Amino acid sequence: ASSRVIVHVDLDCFYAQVEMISNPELKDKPLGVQQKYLVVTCNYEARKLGVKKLMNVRDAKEKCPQLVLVNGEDLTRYREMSYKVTELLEEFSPVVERLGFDENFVDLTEMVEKRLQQLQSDELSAVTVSGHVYNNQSINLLDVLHIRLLVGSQIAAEMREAMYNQLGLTGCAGVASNKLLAKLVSGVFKPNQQTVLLPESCQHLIHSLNHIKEIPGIGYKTAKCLEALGINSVRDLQTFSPKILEKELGISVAQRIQKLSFGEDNSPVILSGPPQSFSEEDSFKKCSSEVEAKNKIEELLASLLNRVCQDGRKPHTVRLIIRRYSSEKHYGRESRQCPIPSHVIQVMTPMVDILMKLFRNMTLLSVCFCNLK
Amino acid sequence: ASSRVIVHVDLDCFYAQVEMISNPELKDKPLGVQQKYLVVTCNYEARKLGVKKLMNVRDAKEKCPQLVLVNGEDLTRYREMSYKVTELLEEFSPVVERLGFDENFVDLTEMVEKRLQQLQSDELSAVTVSGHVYNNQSINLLDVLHIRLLVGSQIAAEMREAMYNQLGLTGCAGVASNKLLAKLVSGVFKPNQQTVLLPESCQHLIHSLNHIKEIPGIGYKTAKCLEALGINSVRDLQTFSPKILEKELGISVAQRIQKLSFGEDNSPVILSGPPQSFSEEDSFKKCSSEVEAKNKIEELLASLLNRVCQDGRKPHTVRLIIRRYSSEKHYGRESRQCPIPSHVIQVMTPMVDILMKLFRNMTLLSVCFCNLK
DNA sequence: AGGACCC
DNA sequence: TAGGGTCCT
DNA sequence: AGGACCC
DNA sequence: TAGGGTCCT
Ligand SMILES: Cc1cn([C@H]2C[C@H](O)[C@@H](COP(=O)(O)OP(=O)(O)OP(=O)(O)O)O2)c(=O)[nH]c1=O
Ligand SMILES: Cc1cn([C@H]2C[C@H](O)[C@@H](COP(=O)(O)OP(=O)(O)OP(=O)(O)O)O2)c(=O)[nH]c1=O
Ligand SMILES: [Mg+2]
Ligand SMILES: [Mg+2]
Ligand SMILES: [Mg+2]
Ligand SMILES: [Mg+2]
Structure with a gap:
């Protein structure tokens, strides 16, 4: 394991x-x-x-x-097509993790080992890659890891072929030994292609990055802080003091991103399953009077109501969000969450009024239905 | 249903x-x-x-x-005995909910109906109560609800008898039609007794309360706010304006406690199962120098480590808490939560140092292990 | 993280 | 006000 | 509730 | 910077 x-x-x-x-x-x-x-x-x-x-x-x-x-x-049609993609990948190996509407992780580990066990001691010398090999690295057929990753690139190709035959969609895939690496290496051959990363080329991949923001997990904020400390390259972060970082992002943020800077990432592929929320949203630049825009709130509702229905599961909580008009504090959303009365869980007319009381406890508007069951 | x-x-x-x-x-x-x-x-x-x-x-x-x-x-021995109590009640009907170390709710609804189905059309005229009947109310053997609640008082007695024969412990029980009512009526006959509440006496029970703080669900804070508005008696809250309360505690806090004031409570008995946290704690009145008291932190750890082990499940998160020396802001705790490295989940020596970095990001001290699996 | 509630 | 513990925003 | 991260 | 969405403190 x-x-x-x-x-x-x-x-x-x-x-x-x-x-x-x-x-x-x-x-x-x-x-x-x-x-x-x-x-x-x-x-x-x-x-x-x-x-x-x-x-x-x-x-x-x-x-x-x-x-x-x-x-x-x-986003209706993009959402539908997003789920048809994930469902298809679910058929190959049940544990699929989504990221955004068009990215999916799949742990091929058990599937690879099953294909390998099927192979007599012989045809395994004919195991070939499907697609690009990151950094044009050579393959060593006696390296058990190279073999598993190549079988991994073949599952990938079959996935891509299915996605295309079955849903008409093209895409890239990357096969690697952890989530971070697989995602980083799926982008190397960009339009409708796939790449596989052998262990020996891990450092090459990680160091090919130009800014630490390019590491999945390090975003706008931690990036700005890392800079304030002189850490700009992936190597800078590699080599930076654990204690000084430990103590300036927190042991959690810090011991983790430091692992990431080396290409190391132990986080498992998690089963995403059905969504944990459905929301609709709307922008308008200081278009909201300050209650001439409850009408905006009835729109979002019409839509959502229908959606959240379809799934079957009902939300047990509603939320409204907002933001206000100024000099680039952009960052600032506010919300009031509230539980959804057990009575209405089985329509519009009372919903509106809850969201409205919620409004009153309070550049753009939105409504979330969370905590689904 | x-x-x-x-x-x-x-x-x-x-x-x-x-x-x-x-x-x-x-x-x-x-x-x-x-x-x-x-x-x-x-x-x-x-x-x-x-x-x-x-x-x-x-x-x-x-x-x-x-x-x-x-x-x-x-609290070791109290904790052990607490679980032996809950486990025993689990044997009667699997869905048992704890509250504190010595209170348990059990939904007897399916069990009652099973006993009733066993009874031929005849001996049911001989269904008697076990224990007190709140307000000395009369029983009506043709009232299906009276019958179920009396069968409910018999399960209660058997539970109490078992608790005593099996664990040596005495206690009270109250049988009613919801959680709020059952808890309120378990206290009426105080030392080692049981009481059952017929529907007709619901208002009598609720109005026998003298302060709305006596309602489970209304605590020190909402009580003080309810007062600032003139709401002192359970009747005051009954009759108080929904909109004005709606808008001053939030629709959630308010539409709920208003239901409570009438004796109405739909919340289901939830299966508590294994604990969601294990913590140890320690007081001392401004006894903490400000790092002569990491030693205090190694104590709490010695103990906990052993505990959290026993269960099997390992915590995936640690937390430290504190409080500081003054003029009755009492209310104020602070904490820093942090995930527990996957490596140490399988000892002391590194733990100490995590909690310590956690200390530094920061009248009394304590350590929680949460998020168990 | 901190709030509010309960034993 | 001890020493715990749970769920929500 | 709000923060931080991702697409 | 759209319109979503997830997990943590
Ligand atoms: C309420 C409360 C209880 N406890 C402990 C002590 C109690 O023995 C135990 C249970 O709480 P209770 O059941 O309220 O107290 P009790 O069982 O001791 O007394 P009674 O016979 O009237 O039911 O938990 C506290 O440590 N702190 C608290 O604030
Ligand atoms: C990143 C990002 C993506 N999206 C939407 C648009 C994209 O079509 C979709 C997927 O994100 P991406 O995969 O980053 O974009 P892409 O698939 O369109 O382009 P590529 O071929 O280079 O992979 O989600 C946004 O709405 N906002 C965002 O900030
Ligand atoms: Mg894409
Ligand atoms: Mg008691
Ligand atoms: Mg009690
Ligand atoms: Mg993408």
């Missing part, structure tokens, strides 16, 4: 794929998917012309006039 | 019982159990002479010179 074979699956310009399947006349034309004043993602044709993900509509059109834009504010 | 038969079991001067069993020469002498400068509880002989629970050692001895005191700082 030590070495693992993990796969990280990450789809190509996800929203844009879904749009392109829904409207075929959009293929081979450069496409962006817009959400308010943001081109949240664009297809590969668009990326060729300079359009970057998360670019404002102004810079996307003055970097590419030639640019088709569809609105992706309503 | 509507009406329920719930039992609330509450032992007599619990700590003192356990002590009296351990040292027989202490029976029939007035006994208190001391924790620092507090007589946390005393036997019935002591209560006859004016000793009240939670009375300071000074007032207990100048209200009763004649007074034997043993130290109850170490």
